[PDB]
UniProtKB/TrEMBL annotation, chain A:
Belongs to the reoviridae RNA-directed RNA polymerase family. This is RNA-directed RNA polymerase. Residues 500-686 form the RdRp catalytic domain. RNA-directed RNA polymerase that is involved in both transcription and genome replication. Together with VP3 capping enzyme, forms an enzyme complex positioned near the channels situated at each of the five-fold vertices of the core. Following infection, the outermost layer of the virus is lost, leaving a double-layered particle (DLP) made up of the core and VP6 shell. VP1 then catalyzes the transcription of fully conservative plus-strand genomic RNAs that are extruded through the DLP's channels into the cytoplasm where they function as mRNAs for translation of viral proteins. Its cofactor is Mg(2+). Keywords: Magnesium, Nucleotide-binding, Nucleotidyltransferase, RNA-binding, RNA-directed RNA polymerase, Transferase, Viral RNA replication, Virion. Signal peptide: none annotated. It comes from Rotavirus A (strain RVA/Monkey/United States/RRV/1975/G3P5B[3]) (RV-A). One of its GO terms (molecular function) is RNA binding. Its EC number is 2.7.7.48.
TrEMBL record, chain C:
The chain holds residues 61 to 99 of 887 of the full protein. Homodecamer; each decamer is made up of two conformers of VP2, called VP2A and VP2B. Interacts with a VP1-VP3 complex. Interacts with the intermediate capsid protein VP6. Interacts with NSP5. Interacts (via N-terminus) with NSP2. It comes from Rotavirus A (strain RVA/Monkey/United States/RRV/1975/G3P5B[3]) (RV-A). This is Inner capsid protein VP2. Inner capsid protein that self-assembles to form an icosahedral capsid with a T=2 symmetry, which consists of 120 copies of VP2, with channels at each of its five-fold vertices. This capsid constitutes the innermost concentric layer of the viral mature particle. It encapsidates the polymerase VP1, the capping enzyme VP3 and the genomic dsRNA, thereby defining the core. Belongs to the rotavirus VP2 family.
UniProtKB/TrEMBL annotation, chain E:
This is Inner capsid protein VP2. The lineage of its organism: Viruses, Riboviria, Orthornavirae, Duplornaviricota, Resentoviricetes. Homodecamer; each decamer is made up of two conformers of VP2, called VP2A and VP2B. Interacts with a VP1-VP3 complex. Interacts with the intermediate capsid protein VP6. Interacts with NSP5. Interacts (via N-terminus) with NSP2. The N-terminus binds RNA. It is necessary for encapsidation of VP1 and VP3. The N-termini of 10 VP2 molecules form a cylindrical hub underneath each 5-fold axis of the inner capsid. It comes from Rotavirus A (strain RVA/Monkey/United States/RRV/1975/G3P5B[3]) (RV-A). Inner capsid protein that self-assembles to form an icosahedral capsid with a T=2 symmetry, which consists of 120 copies of VP2, with channels at each of its five-fold vertices. This capsid constitutes the innermost concentric layer of the viral mature particle. It encapsidates the polymerase VP1, the capping enzyme VP3 and the genomic dsRNA, thereby defining the core. The chain holds residues 85 to 99 of 887 of the full protein. Sumoylated with SUMO1 and SUMO2. Sumoylation of viral proteins seems to have a positive role on viral replication. Belongs to the rotavirus VP2 family. It comes from the Viruses. It is found in: Virion.
Length: 1086, 296, 39, 50, 15, 50, 49, 50, 99
């Protein structure tokens, strides 16, 4: 309940001119008070129009400002020019930074003046520096300066925080003021004209530095931030890698004194096992070399901190190491040229001097894995393999982006990259030939996208024609079905939907065991991803062809084999100025349907071969092998306790055996912990890097500034949970900057706290960190209803596309492939489903989003005169709130701390009620209807759509299922079985869990079925209304958990809900009309 | 361990639970997870090895807790539990399962009674299977045996081979056949449902008892100091929901101490014992020398 | 509306309220049965 | 006369009316009021007298 | 709506 | 005294209450609170004494 | 009947408190019905039990 | 073959499936389709032959 | 469970199959007879037209074994399930009724 005050103070700060006026708008559910609100708003508008002060009106309508709820603030300012520089000159007292132009290997990566890199405006490109975020550097400077003004007169540790941040911002502000604040355009891009005489990386460096300095609280924070901010001005390439390198060894220096053990996808059983860390001298030499590299780059504080920690190598002081690791990733992205990044990726030294025996065994293992994955569906004539083309057509929405093509629908021309629209266009023009896989050779080389992650090297992505996806979809789906129940495939293994996000490596860690872990992210152009890998897959397909008598399955396998054959001899396109390089590339890359599963298969085969060779010199049992995306790790158990020499010998043997196959591996062997891309374990504890950048983005998103503010808050929450706390006031300042909309060049509307924190499509953040927003008061229900009224919007582009003959022809072909002939009713439902699937196209979704935002803005400019009987979640909670009695309770701490970087209050919740055991899926995946849908298409209807559908008539449900692509017989079986009667409860559970973010943020870490938690909830059971009991119990759990989060203490809840109230609420529980913005989903794991 | 979600779903099917009440269930399903099962296994074996008194924590409204407590008192000698917690657990079992099953009036048990509730029920119960199980639980004790020069507490051979699990089962079966004359039919249904949940895993229970006994004796071979059975000042709290989790989630996977783990445990015990004796020798030498040197 | 005594319809006592809710649910159930018969 | 509300509640409690089930017992509550009771009393006595 | 359609029936539980 | 909330929950478990059925057992929990218990204790002893 | 021991304890407590406070009465306890009564709710008895 | 819809409806009627309760009978209908029937026929006869 | 017998504690690697133990332990004649037939149902190795063939029992060929199975199933349906809740017997009866 602080956002509105901070907003008003920020408006005063940024519009300190004497002509600046803030007009606060209010709303109320009470008609008597709403009339006063309307009169107050009218009088404020009239006074501003006549230019009269509004102070007296705050006395005339002091009840409105008291009893009504603030809806927004209208700001009128007329002196906006050169305001940020006027504020900044105060903080530019320090010495500006001078870039070292001999730090980066590539010339254009040195932070020199833009003219020195792009002599003419035609040569200029901001792609190598673009923050790719819809917020300006001027806004970041304004937010930092507002924070400094607000906290200028703090005392105690607050004053120390202010002083540290003032020093860091003095650095940043002096550097920026030396050249002047560059001005963004409407697209938040920085043009050549405003960047000629500035350092090229000034804007992105300034954004990263502002984030870092606003993330500083302690002295160690200040030292790390100062070092990184000063060094990243000159270093743009190797700084993050330099700082993150030691961690891969540090995890191996901490003994385990008790640890966690994964059971099923989030369930941990805890061990009191003690394991000593066995570290050979070579590892210490490597760590010494890493620290020497740090110092050679100008680092003094970070290596000194690491050396100080190395005195004891204790897990209690390891949080500083985790802090350095997380901070390393906030020096921004490395958006080097596609040519250099690709050439780094496809830098290969292929040799004929490889071990033929090893390669033949590896190929045989790949063949065996493919056969194991696809034997049963191939032998039994699985429907998906019989209708592979139809399955691919139905699942096109889940395909990767193609290369942009000029499509025409009706009389409109578009430039979609969506493969479904490409299929539509080709069908309309007689170019749809699934049976032919286009070559990807020097005649039609593959265009390349890029995936960039801070610290990590850039990855190339194939952009293939849609025929590859059509050919590969069904086979890869069968592969994923197999891999979901295979524990070795960490990326895919899951009992229902959730992955082993904590990993499974600590179960077999012992004093007779060692864990070998290897980074394999650089094995895209390795010699083992060449002909051997593709030919192993081809041999598997050839074997599978003999196991089936269905011509359609054989044709599916033939098309998959043809895709592999074509990809064996493939070329890639890379632009370079005015010349396109066609580079031979017969290796693996993402952007193909099978890439993830195929990489897992190949890595498993390769590690099996390597371990087979390593068994020559040592006797051990391989306990587990896990291939988790960019990393692999295997646990080897020995008949003796592990010694230093054993660890060193195993590491050397693994490296040499991988080299025998021409694979360059840095084989890291430990006894106590590992470090992989998505987590690292040290001292029996698990850590996740908190490197999500806030003021910089990898690439320009297809969202709005509103949704980007929501994503900014979500990223801030995820970073905070992982141990990287940015000041919440700075985040709220950014939120108010990004959610404001210009009614005119002089008038700007700032939404209030209620607007932004309310559960709706417009939700951006929560008033309290880690607590889902809900409220039982009349105003909150009223505004939720009003916002729900604005959710439904149309798209003109979607309408024109759906009305075009191209879309109608596509729907007709889809229907005839679905065994319907001029049905006239089924076809219309299929057309609706395909029009919905068109929502993945960025212009359509953006048009809908902007329509919603515009409607919201029109509503916000006036007091909300909207009333409806529509039921929202706040209505349910208001109904059930009065019957809950609250008492003070106590829970002892009886659960282990396994995530040391969790915030203290979240950690308290975990210690008191425990961590999540098993997760109820948020999409209703384990409902009969959802399983039926997944049987034919990977398209996932939103849980809201399923919630609406499951309460319709039987024929309506049947028609919806047929539209999704389920055959009529199966849909009629589902409906006539009356299975929807049981399915509606699972659907309601998933719907409510989605609305209340039970599977997001900190809630995903909690156990909502904890015996300790349910010991605090006392709801006498009344049967035969499961929906009401479910919502009552979930609400009680949320209330208790949120109270503990906010206060750090516990409350018991008691609700003797009357039966009549239960029956009344039962009717409403199936008519809930509520939404929550997906942009507010804070996924702790990513 | 059996997947917690899958086992919970199976238990819901057996209990014929109302939809969506798995989260709110507190009579059978509360507290069942792999962490609790592992903690129960560790707590039982460690308490028996160190001869540390245990304290039972349970909610009388949870019938599954009472049935798991029946199994626990069958397999673990009752001297391992603090008297008050054991008395409370036995009283809950008697007044919730046995006496209502046989139509006997609820036991009015006096706090501080020289006899445990099971000792009274054994006299008062006419059914042979139930009375025999009660007698065994009353008289199930450790045996003090000096093995390889070290005093050890040895479990009954019928516990070691899991045969007692049959005896308990027999009693449970006889409880499932009773009429519950004084109770509503739903009460008998709830007791039958709990007994059914426990007895769907009779083979797993025999396996678990044998595994507990084997791990206990294997780690007991590594102890160098006498296992003295005496009640301790403080206890280790054992929740009956953890026992229920162990009973409901234990698979067919045999886990036995690793040889290197046994060697490390034995070495730690030897080092502690040797340090104890050497410091005793130092103190005794200094004290005796000071006395003989007349340092008054 | 339900053809019961006015003192039950206007009652704030929980027994009367639950009786009214049960009667409304029963009427809706019979209407649903007849609707399914018609369909 | 016994309160119509109280007697109706007692009849509902005795009949144990189930919302999800169509029952004959529901119709037992038809036309229970004090005016009907007085109508019956007067009708019976007056008809016997006349 | 389905419930709304069912309301259209002219049945009253107590006559 | 035994917690009123815990005792109410225990009794409700023992009573098998159904929200869609009108039951006599719904009244069994009526007026169960510690204030009433103390009032009963005091009333009984004081009435017998006086 | 799930509170049989508690009922025995409650009866003993009631009797003991009654007789202990009765030891402090000085005027004769005359048993005769009074003009007005003290209302006792059976729900209070249920609460006590 | 018997229509899967009609047979599944008949099985639902015979099992008296209840929406409120979690039942074992609900799983009885899992994976009943004509494709599965043909797969079973082919698998049995082919396995016996080979 | 139909006959109230204690759950079989079958050992992995046991020389006898579970049905072979149940046949000795089950007292109902129809169920025990069906169990014995299932235990002893085997292919007959016969040379027909010079080729070795595996031949089904004649009672399988004419579908008469289905009657023995159905008699066993009806006997199971008639049982009381003394130790089970009535809903469990209901579920087993409903499955047997489906068959």
């Amino acid at each position: 309940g602080k956002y509105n005050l901070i907003l008003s103070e920020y408006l005063s700060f940024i519009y300190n001119s004497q002509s600046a006026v803030q007009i606060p708008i209010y709303y109320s559910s009470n008609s008597e008070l709403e009339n006063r609100c309307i009169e107050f708003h009218s009088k404020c508008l009239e006074n501003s129009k006549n230019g009269l002060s509004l102070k007296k009106l705050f006395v005339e309508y002091s009840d409105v400002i008291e009893n009504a709820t603030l809806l927004s603030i209208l700001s009128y300012s007329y002196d906006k020019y050169n305001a940020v520089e006027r504020k900044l000159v105060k903080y530019a007292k320090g010495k500006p930074l001078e870039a070292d132009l001999t730090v980066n290997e590539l010339d254009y990566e040195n932070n020199k003046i833009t003219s020195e890199l792009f002599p003419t405006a035609e040569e200029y490109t901001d792609l190598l520096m673009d923050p790719a975020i819809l917020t300006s550097l001027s806004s970041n400077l304004n937010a930092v300066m507002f924070w400094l003004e607000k906290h200028e007169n703090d005392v105690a540790e607050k004053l120390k925080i202010y002083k540290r941040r003032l020093d860091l911002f003095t650095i940043v502000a002096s550097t920026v003021n030396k050249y002047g604040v560059p001005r963004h355009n409407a697209k938040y891009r920085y043009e050549y004209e405003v960047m000629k005489d500035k350092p090229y990386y000034l804007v992105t460096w300034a954004n990263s530095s502002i984030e870092m300095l606003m993330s500083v609280f302690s002295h160690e924070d200040y030292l790390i931030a100062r070092e990184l901010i000063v060094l990243s001005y000159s270093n743009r390439s190797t700084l993050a890698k330099l700082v993150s390198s030691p961690m891969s060894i540090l995890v191996a220096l901490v003994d385990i004194n008790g640890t966690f053990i994964t059971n099923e996808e989030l369930e941990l059983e805890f061990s009191n096992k003690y394991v000593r860390a066995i570290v050979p001298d070579q590892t210490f030499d490597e760590l010494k070399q890493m620290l020497d590299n740090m110092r050679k780059a100008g680092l003094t504080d970070i290596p000194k901190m690491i050396q100080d920690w190395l005195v004891d190598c204790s897990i209690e002081k390891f949080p500083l190491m985790a802090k350095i690791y997380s901070w390393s990733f906030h020096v921004g992205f490395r958006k080097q040229k596609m040519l250099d990044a690709a050439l780094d990726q496809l830098k290969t030294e292929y040799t004929e001097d490889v071990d033929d025996e090893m390669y033949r065994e590896y190929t045989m293992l790949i063949r065996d894995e493919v056969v194991k994955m696809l034997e049963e569906p191939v032998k039994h004539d699985d429907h998906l393999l019989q209708d592979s083309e139809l399955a691919g057509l139905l699942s096109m929405s889940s395909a990767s982006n193609g290369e942009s093509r000029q499509l025409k629908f009706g009389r409109k021309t578009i430039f979609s990259t969506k493969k479904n629209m490409h299929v539509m266009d080709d069908m309309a023009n007689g170019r749809y030939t699934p049976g032919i896989i286009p070559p990807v050779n020097v005649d039609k080389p593959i265009p390349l996208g890029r995936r960039d992650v801070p610290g990590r090297r850039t990855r190339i992505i194939f952009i293939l024609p849609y025929e590859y996806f059509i050919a590969q979809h069904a086979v890869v789906e069968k592969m994923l079905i197999y891999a979901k129940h295979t524990r070795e495939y960490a990326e895919f293994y899951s009992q229902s939907n959730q992955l082993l996000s904590y990993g499974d490596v600590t179960r077999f860690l012992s004093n007779n065991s060692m864990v070998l872990y290897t980074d394999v992210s650089q094995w895209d152009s390795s010699q083992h991803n060449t002909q051997p890998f593709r030919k192993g897959i081809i041999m598997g397909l050839d074997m599978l062809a003999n196991m089936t008598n269905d011509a359609r399955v054989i044709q599916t396998l033939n098309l998959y084999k043809q895709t592999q054959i074509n990809l064996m001899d493939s070329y890639v396109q890379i632009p370079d100025g005015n010349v396109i390089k066609k580079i031979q590339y017969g290796a693996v890359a993402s952007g193909e349907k099978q890439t993830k599963a195929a990489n897992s298969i190949a890595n498993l085969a390769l590690i099996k071969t390597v371990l087979s060779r390593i068994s020559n010199k040592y006797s051990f049992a391989t306990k587990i092998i896990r291939v988790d995306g960019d990393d692999n790790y295997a646990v080897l158990q020995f008949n003796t306790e592990v010694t230093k020499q054993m660890v060193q010998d195993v590491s050397n043997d693994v490296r040499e055996t991988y080299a025998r196959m021409n694979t360059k591996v840095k084989a890291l062997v430990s006894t106590v912990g590992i470090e992989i891309a998505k987590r690292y374990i040290a001292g029996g504890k698990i850590f996740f890097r908190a490197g999500i950048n806030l003021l910089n983005n990898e690439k320009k998103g297809q969202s709005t500034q509103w949704d980007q503010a929501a994503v900014l808050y979500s990223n801030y929450i995820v970073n905070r949970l992982r141990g990287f706390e940015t000041d919440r006031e700075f985040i709220l300042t950014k939120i108010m900057q990004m959610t404001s909309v210009a009614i005119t060049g002089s008038l700007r509307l700032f939404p209030s706290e209620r607007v932004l924190t309310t559960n709706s499509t417009f939700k951006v953040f929560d008033s309290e960190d880690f607590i889902i927003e809900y409220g039982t008061t009349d105003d909150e229900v009223y505004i939720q209803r009003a916002f729900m009224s604005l959710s439904s919007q149309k798209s003109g582009i979607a309408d024109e596309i759906a009305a075009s003959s191209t879309f109608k022809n596509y729907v007709s072909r889809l229907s005839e492939q679905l065994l319907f002939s001029k049905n006239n009713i089924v076809s219309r439902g299929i057309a609706l489903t395909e029009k919905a699937k068109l929502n993945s196209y960025a212009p359509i979704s953006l048009e809908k989003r902007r329509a919603q935002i515009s409607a919201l803005l029109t509503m916000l400019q006036k007091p909300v005169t909207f009333k409806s009987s529509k039921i929202t979640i706040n209505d349910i909670l208001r109904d059930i709130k009065p019957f809950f009695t609250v008492n003070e309770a106590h829970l002892p701490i009886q659960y282990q701390k396994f995530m040391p970087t969790l915030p203290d209050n979240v950690q308290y919740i975990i210690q008191c009620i425990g961590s999540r055991t098993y997760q109820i899926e948020d999409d209703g995946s384990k409902s009969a209807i959802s399983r039926l849908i997944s049987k034919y298409s990977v398209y996932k209807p939103s849980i809201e759509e399923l919630y609406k559908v499951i309460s319709l008539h039987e024929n309506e449900i049947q028609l919806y299922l047929i539209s999704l692509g389920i055959p009529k017989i199966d849909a009629d079986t589902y409906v006539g079985s009356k299975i929807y009667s049981q399915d509606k409860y699972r659907i309601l559970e998933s719907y409510v869990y989605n609305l209340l973010s039970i599977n997001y943020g900190c809630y995903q870490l909690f156990d909502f079925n904890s015996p300790d938690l349910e010991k605090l909830i006392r709801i006498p059971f009344k049967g035969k209304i499961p929906a009401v009991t479910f919502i009552l119990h979930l609400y009680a759990k949320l209330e208790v958990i949120n109270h503990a989060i906010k206060n750090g203490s516990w409350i018991s809840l008691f609700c003797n809900y009357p039966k009549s109230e239960m029956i009344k609420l039962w009717k409403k529980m199936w008519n809930i009309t509520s939404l929550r913005s997906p942009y507010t989903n804070a996924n702790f794991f990513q | 361990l059996v997947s917690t979600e899958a086992q919970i779903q199976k238990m819901s099917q057996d209990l014929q639970l109302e939809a969506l009440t798995i989260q709110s269930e507190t009579q059978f399903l509360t507290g069942i997870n792999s962490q609790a099962a592992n903690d129960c296994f560790k707590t039982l074996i460690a308490a028996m090895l160190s001869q540390r008194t245990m304290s039972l924590d349970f909610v009388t409204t949870n019938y599954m807790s009472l049935i798991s407590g029946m199994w626990l008192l069958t397999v673990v000698p009752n001297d391992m539990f603090i008297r008050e917690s054991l008395v409370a657990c036995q009283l809950a079992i008697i007044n919730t399962i046995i006496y209502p099953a046989f139509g006997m009036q609820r036991m009015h048990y006096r706090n501080g009674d020289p006899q445990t509730p099971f000792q009274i029920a054994e006299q008062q119960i006419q059914n042979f299977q139930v009375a025999n199980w009660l007698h065994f639980v009353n008289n199930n004790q450790f045996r003090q045996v000096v093995i390889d020069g070290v005093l050890n507490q040895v479990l009954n051979d019928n516990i070691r081979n899991g045969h007692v699990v049959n005896q308990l089962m027999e009693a449970l079966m006889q409880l499932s056949r009773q009429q519950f004359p004084t109770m509503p039919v739903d009460y008998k249904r709830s007791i039958q449902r709990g007994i059914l949940l426990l007895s769907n895993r009779l083979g797993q229970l025999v396996d678990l008892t044998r595994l507990l006994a084997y791990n206990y004796e294997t780690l007991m071979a590594c102890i160098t100091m006498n296992m003295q059975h005496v009640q301790t000042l403080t206890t280790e709290k054992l929740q009956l929901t953890s026992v229920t989790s162990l009973c409901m989630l234990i698979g067919n996977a045999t886990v036995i101490p690793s040889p290197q783990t046994l060697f490390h445990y034995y070495n730690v015990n030897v080092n502690f014992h040797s340090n104890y004796n050497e410091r005793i020798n130092d103190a005794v030498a200094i004290i005796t020398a000071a006395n003989r040197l007349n340092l008054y | 509306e339900i053809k019961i005594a006015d003192e039950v319809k206007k009652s704030n006592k929980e027994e009367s309220k639950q009786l009214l809710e049960v009667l409304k649910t029963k009427e809706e159930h019979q209407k649903e049965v007849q609707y399914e018969i018609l369909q």
